[PDB]
Write a protein that holds these residues in place. Sequence first.
Motif, PDB file in Angstrom:
ATOM      1  N   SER A   1     -47.460  10.101  -8.394  1.00 30.04           N
ATOM      2  CA  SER A   1     -47.382  11.418  -9.014  1.00 30.04           C
ATOM      3  C   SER A   1     -46.918  12.457  -8.011  1.00 30.04           C
ATOM      4  CB  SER A   1     -48.691  11.785  -9.624  1.00 30.04           C
ATOM      5  OG  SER A   1     -49.670  11.451  -8.728  1.00 30.04           O
ATOM      6  N   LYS A   2     -47.240  13.710  -8.201  1.00 31.84           N
ATOM      7  CA  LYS A   2     -46.808  14.663  -7.209  1.00 31.84           C
ATOM      8  C   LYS A   2     -47.913  15.067  -6.237  1.00 31.84           C
ATOM      9  CE  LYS A   2     -45.854  18.753  -8.280  1.00 31.84           C
ATOM     10  NZ  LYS A   2     -45.092  19.772  -8.934  1.00 31.84           N
ATOM     11  N   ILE A   3     -49.164  14.966  -6.633  1.00 31.23           N
ATOM     12  CA  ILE A   3     -50.243  14.414  -5.828  1.00 31.23           C
ATOM     13  C   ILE A   3     -49.851  12.990  -5.557  1.00 31.23           C
ATOM     14  CG2 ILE A   3     -52.607  13.870  -5.922  1.00 31.23           C
ATOM     15  CD1 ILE A   3     -51.596  16.018  -8.571  1.00 31.23           C
ATOM     16  N   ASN A   4     -50.062  12.493  -4.361  1.00 29.62           N
ATOM     17  CA  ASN A   4     -49.604  11.223  -3.833  1.00 29.62           C
ATOM     18  C   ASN A   4     -48.141  11.267  -3.475  1.00 29.62           C
ATOM     19  OD1 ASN A   4     -52.218   9.916  -4.440  1.00 29.62           O
ATOM     20  ND2 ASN A   4     -51.401   9.402  -6.431  1.00 29.62           N
ATOM     21  N   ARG A   5     -47.438  12.360  -3.577  1.00 31.94           N
ATOM     22  CA  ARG A   5     -46.201  12.527  -2.824  1.00 31.94           C
ATOM     23  C   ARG A   5     -46.187  13.938  -2.283  1.00 31.94           C
ATOM     24  NH1 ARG A   5     -42.318  13.109  -5.846  1.00 31.94           N
ATOM     25  NH2 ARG A   5     -43.560  13.146  -7.739  1.00 31.94           N
ATOM     26  N   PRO A   6     -47.066  14.251  -1.324  1.00 29.56           N
ATOM     27  CA  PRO A   6     -47.390  15.641  -1.009  1.00 29.56           C
ATOM     28  C   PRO A   6     -46.344  16.240  -0.100  1.00 29.56           C
ATOM     29  CG  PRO A   6     -49.181  14.213  -0.603  1.00 29.56           C
ATOM     30  CD  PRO A   6     -47.989  13.390  -0.589  1.00 29.56           C
TER      31      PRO A   6
ATOM     32  N   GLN B   1     -45.481  10.597   5.416  1.00 32.89           N
ATOM     33  CA  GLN B   1     -45.991  11.228   4.227  1.00 32.89           C
ATOM     34  C   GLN B   1     -47.009  12.271   4.622  1.00 32.89           C
ATOM     35  OE1 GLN B   1     -48.808   8.632   2.034  1.00 32.89           O
ATOM     36  NE2 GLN B   1     -47.404   7.095   2.826  1.00 32.89           N
ATOM     37  N   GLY B   2     -46.964  13.406   3.969  1.00 27.80           N
ATOM     38  CA  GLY B   2     -47.911  14.447   4.251  1.00 27.80           C
ATOM     39  C   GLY B   2     -49.218  14.115   3.630  1.00 27.80           C
ATOM     40  N   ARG B   3     -50.242  14.882   3.965  1.00 30.33           N
ATOM     41  CA  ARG B   3     -51.609  14.452   3.701  1.00 30.33           C
ATOM     42  C   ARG B   3     -51.905  14.487   2.223  1.00 30.33           C
ATOM     43  NH1 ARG B   3     -54.916  17.782   7.965  1.00 30.33           N
ATOM     44  NH2 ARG B   3     -56.305  17.808   6.140  1.00 30.33           N
ATOM     45  N   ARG B   4     -52.537  13.462   1.725  1.00 22.63           N
ATOM     46  CA  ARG B   4     -52.762  13.445   0.302  1.00 22.63           C
ATOM     47  C   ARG B   4     -53.912  14.331  -0.103  1.00 22.63           C
ATOM     48  NH1 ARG B   4     -52.237   7.604  -1.657  1.00 22.63           N
ATOM     49  NH2 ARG B   4     -50.176   6.932  -1.021  1.00 22.63           N
ATOM     50  N   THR B   5     -54.838  14.570   0.802  1.00 18.62           N
ATOM     51  CA  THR B   5     -55.941  15.490   0.616  1.00 18.62           C
ATOM     52  C   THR B   5     -55.748  16.748   1.417  1.00 18.62           C
ATOM     53  OG1 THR B   5     -57.291  15.060   2.464  1.00 18.62           O
ATOM     54  CG2 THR B   5     -57.221  13.451   0.732  1.00 18.62           C
ATOM     55  N   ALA B   6     -54.504  17.185   1.551  1.00 19.21           N
ATOM     56  CA  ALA B   6     -54.260  18.508   2.084  1.00 19.21           C
ATOM     57  C   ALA B   6     -54.745  19.555   1.128  1.00 19.21           C
ATOM     58  CB  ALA B   6     -52.782  18.712   2.334  1.00 19.21           C
ATOM     59  N   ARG B   7     -54.657  19.272  -0.171  1.00 23.02           N
ATOM     60  CA  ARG B   7     -54.771  20.277  -1.193  1.00 23.02           C
ATOM     61  C   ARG B   7     -56.218  20.660  -1.425  1.00 23.02           C
ATOM     62  NH1 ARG B   7     -54.331  18.031  -6.975  1.00 23.02           N
ATOM     63  NH2 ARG B   7     -55.673  16.219  -6.904  1.00 23.02           N
ATOM     64  N   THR B   8     -56.391  21.762  -2.140  1.00 19.46           N
ATOM     65  CA  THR B   8     -57.670  22.417  -2.284  1.00 19.46           C
ATOM     66  C   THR B   8     -58.406  22.008  -3.520  1.00 19.46           C
ATOM     67  OG1 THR B   8     -57.220  24.357  -3.632  1.00 19.46           O
ATOM     68  CG2 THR B   8     -56.452  24.393  -1.384  1.00 19.46           C
ATOM     69  N   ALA B   9     -57.800  21.202  -4.393  1.00 19.76           N
ATOM     70  CA  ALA B   9     -58.581  20.535  -5.426  1.00 19.76           C
ATOM     71  C   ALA B   9     -59.497  19.521  -4.819  1.00 19.76           C
ATOM     72  CB  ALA B   9     -57.689  19.834  -6.420  1.00 19.76           C
ATOM     73  N   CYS B  10     -59.114  18.960  -3.710  1.00 21.56           N
ATOM     74  CA  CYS B  10     -59.864  17.948  -3.039  1.00 21.56           C
ATOM     75  C   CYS B  10     -61.008  18.505  -2.235  1.00 21.56           C
ATOM     76  CB  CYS B  10     -58.907  17.169  -2.163  1.00 21.56           C
ATOM     77  SG  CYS B  10     -57.466  16.625  -3.074  1.00 21.56           S
ATOM     78  N   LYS B  11     -61.136  19.816  -2.135  1.00 20.41           N
ATOM     79  CA  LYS B  11     -62.181  20.381  -1.306  1.00 20.41           C
ATOM     80  C   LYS B  11     -63.546  20.293  -1.936  1.00 20.41           C
ATOM     81  CE  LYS B  11     -59.514  22.506   1.888  1.00 20.41           C
ATOM     82  NZ  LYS B  11     -58.692  23.648   1.483  1.00 20.41           N
TER      83      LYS B  11
END
Lengths: 158, 187, 173, 223, 75
Positions: free
Chosen positions: B53-58, B139-149
């Motif tokens: 998805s686009k999460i998992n292709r960060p 690949q950039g971090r898959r848990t960079a994003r703030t939904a993952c916080k």
Amino acid sequence: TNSKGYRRGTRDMFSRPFRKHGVIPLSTYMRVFKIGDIVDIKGHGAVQKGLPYKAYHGKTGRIFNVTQHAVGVIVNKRVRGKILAKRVNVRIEHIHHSKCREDFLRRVKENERLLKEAKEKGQWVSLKRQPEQPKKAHFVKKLEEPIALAPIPYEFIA
Amino acid sequence: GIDINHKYDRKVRRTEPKSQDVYLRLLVKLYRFLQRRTNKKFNRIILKRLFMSKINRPPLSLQRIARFFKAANQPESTIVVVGTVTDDARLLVVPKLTVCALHVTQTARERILKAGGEVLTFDQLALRSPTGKNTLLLQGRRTARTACKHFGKAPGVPHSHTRPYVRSKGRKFERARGRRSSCGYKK
Amino acid sequence: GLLKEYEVVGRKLPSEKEPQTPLYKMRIFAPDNIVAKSRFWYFLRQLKKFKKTTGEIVSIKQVYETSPVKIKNFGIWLRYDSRSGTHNMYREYRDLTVGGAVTQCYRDMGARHRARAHSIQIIKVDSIPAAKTRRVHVKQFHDSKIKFPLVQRVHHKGNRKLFSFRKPRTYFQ
Amino acid sequence: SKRVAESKRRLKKAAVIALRKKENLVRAEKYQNEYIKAEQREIKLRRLAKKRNQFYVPAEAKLAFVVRIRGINKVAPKVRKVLQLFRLRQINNGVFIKLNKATINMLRIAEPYITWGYPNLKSVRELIYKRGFVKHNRQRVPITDNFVIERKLRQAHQIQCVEDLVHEIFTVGPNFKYASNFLWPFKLNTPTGGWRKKANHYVNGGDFGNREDQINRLLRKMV
Amino acid sequence: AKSKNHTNHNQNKKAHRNGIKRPLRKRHESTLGMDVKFLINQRYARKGNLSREESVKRYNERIASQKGKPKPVTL
RNA sequence: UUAUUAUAUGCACUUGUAUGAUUAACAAUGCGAAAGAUUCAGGAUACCUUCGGGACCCGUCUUGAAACACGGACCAAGGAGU
RNA sequence: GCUGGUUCCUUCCGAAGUUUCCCUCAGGAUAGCUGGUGCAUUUUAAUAAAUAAUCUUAUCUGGUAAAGCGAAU
RNA sequence: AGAUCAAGGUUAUGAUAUAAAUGUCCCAGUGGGCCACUUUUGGUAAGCAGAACUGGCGCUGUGGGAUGAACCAAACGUAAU
RNA sequence: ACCUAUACAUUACCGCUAAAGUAGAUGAUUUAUAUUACUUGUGAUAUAAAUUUUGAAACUUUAGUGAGUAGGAAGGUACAAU
């Protein structure tokens, strides 16, 4: 309609033995205990300063933090059912040394040495344990008092 | 008779791109063929990453394109990124590098080209390095994003630190009882 | 089955404080080889310490009695459990073969006393010659010349015709 | 320049297939003369130890044959687990088992659903010839030739022929664990003539537990 | 009413369905709640580990300043 | 030394055996037959006739419904997760 | 927080009546159990010198069955 | 207690792997259970009341016990043998 | 001895689940034959005829396997409009 609380049903976990009451023998304070060592827990009923609870007496686990006169052990406690890793502090007389490694640590020596004598003869190692096989085919002579020797019942009249 | 096969014998994965994109659903058609006839593991992890998805292709900023490249010893290794390469203004001087990407932001295409190196679609990669010799697949971090916080939360353990679903940041918004040792308790 | 006869020998496997442990033997009637080897241990768990595995079964063999066409009358000693009632007995049968007169016991002991064969134990079996047989139904089968005109068949009912035609008039004299 | 390559492949695949057949003949010849010197020795040892009045015990048996006999429901979670690990999950499946103290206490646990006994050579052969199958990445490939044992087991063991399976199983060899876990469990069918009780022991009624020579005679009618 | 308050049927069939879940075997473990120095000492020896090849031999030459160490075998 | 086994059969040529989930050779019966029209097999399609076997009434709540539990005589339109 | 209903067909997986709290005991929240959807990858992952769950070994613990009152109570 | 060097044989019980590991949606439902071996408390008993273990019924048809929610066999794609 | 299940087994078929294979077709492949390099011998060249697409969202190969309320997910299907 209960248990609760903290030392209930310890009329025999922390009872003393038959006639082992009294002064704790003084080697218990003299043992050396290291970090990562493995250890058992038998809550000693004559020392109230930080007994383990009753759910850890009987259970072995690894030390990982030693202090002035107590030790912080890591004991696996099963809850439902996800086995947790607990982090228990207990004193010293509620702890013994395990023996469960002690046989293995003499098996690591000998498998180092049974390969060491076989370092010179070369062949062959035969290092790993086997469980009990069938014995063999023998033959046994009487040789010594031939047979019968013959047990036959008569078992009631009484 | 046999007890058993239960479940999940149905293994769990995704096996074609969910994008109905006619450009992406053609690079897949190609990279099926570049990993069943050249059994590289480099080419699995492009067919596997053409699926996600686009999460998992960060996104992976222009500075990590460069900050990784300058970990040296490969001065002609093209940088392979199955996703987006955005632009870092905090990098000022950008080294001349060669980039493979699904999408490149134009403020990064205007900079890499100016340096100037290349910008490659994934069909020019495979027509150049089909086996992936001299490439850097990042690949950039898959848990960079703030939904993952916010994953996952017992206040009562000494390790949660996991970010409620408030509406707003301030006092008189979840800041009182159960956070402070005065009001109620410290969590 | 028909209860063949064995001679099954034990060992007490020989652990180092005592090698050569002293080799007891039994006389077992069982239908088969391997059930003879498990009567042996039930009858070893009463006399010697000795269980499996603390012990072995060194050579057994099936034995083939000595005179299979002599008309000897056996006298067996027995121990059996009732509903309430473990009892000694002593019974006698006429048979050509020894294991034919232990299986003659079982189907009779099991009928006349309800005696399921796990609660019967054989504690002696011997041929008893004559003039020691007590047991009235044996010693009427002694006196040569024994005349006895029991006109006997099964008189197969009826024959190859179900709806026969001929009315079979047994006596035929 | 292809036809040069393939007809050198095709004639070196022939010479290796030819150099298996003779190497699987004289290897089956050597394995067969073992099973003649073996059983003739145990005749020789008894006709020896009789005249010296000693008692000749034979060898205790390694190599059981273990066959699930009874039923997939109403089973308890510790006989449920032994019978999974013995790979016996259907009725009338059978696996080969090496006997020691450590599986016999597992056959004790799973005892009322298992009949077992120690197999004849004829029983070892007839089970892999008539019923015998093979694991090719979880697939149940039959036998159909002995390439399909030569494939997965010649390079990392030295089993290549079908009689090398039989030899590694009758004489319970060092590669036993590889050549029982090679064979998919033998999906036998229901014995003609029948069982006796299925749920009383063999010493009492007749099924579960050690038959111990009569797995051969049962397997006659099961295979 | 009173039919069934507080039973354990189906409770280890559940606890053995998504099964019984041993914890972990972590190479490093948290030092959270250890002796607090201890750990400031090891945080001081972790910084001063400077010699891989260089000074690690050199201090043996300093042992020979007392021609070795004959005396201190006692304390 | 007594035996035993394998290797030392190319070039052609067969309607030959094997192996590609190893069924095919022989005969008989009968003509898709111009439109016209029979033969052989099959058709619990959706029924009527004759027998055998099986077979309690659905929806619901319930630990448990054929229930001496509730709703339902039947039919078309409407009718409830936005 | 109660009664009644809640409209297509196949294919796949498949429960719970338990725990803690509640003016709570015909209800909730809460964990357990469930499905979905992925993802990471192993000489137990794709053309093992390493994991994991019944036996074995080794070693800890226990005060029930049995035993005891010519040991204490 | 650690950070880097030196030496180390054949990797250290058995048998298993219908793949395992891990996030999220803590998403649906559920939070009235009944039955049974062995253990067991209250009751005089109960097809009563309450617990421990395992397996079942609930959700499950088929074979058997004339009959039956749980018994004994056996678990179920459409068919032949 | 023998009878008897939706169990066991071997086979055909349906689905599921898990693997595996195929895309140079101004190419691949046969059968002959002319020529031929010739290596004895087998290939390469010319001729004549022949086979050789698939919603690659497809086709081909292989193995295991199938209970289900409450409940969830996929794929179809009826209705009517843009």
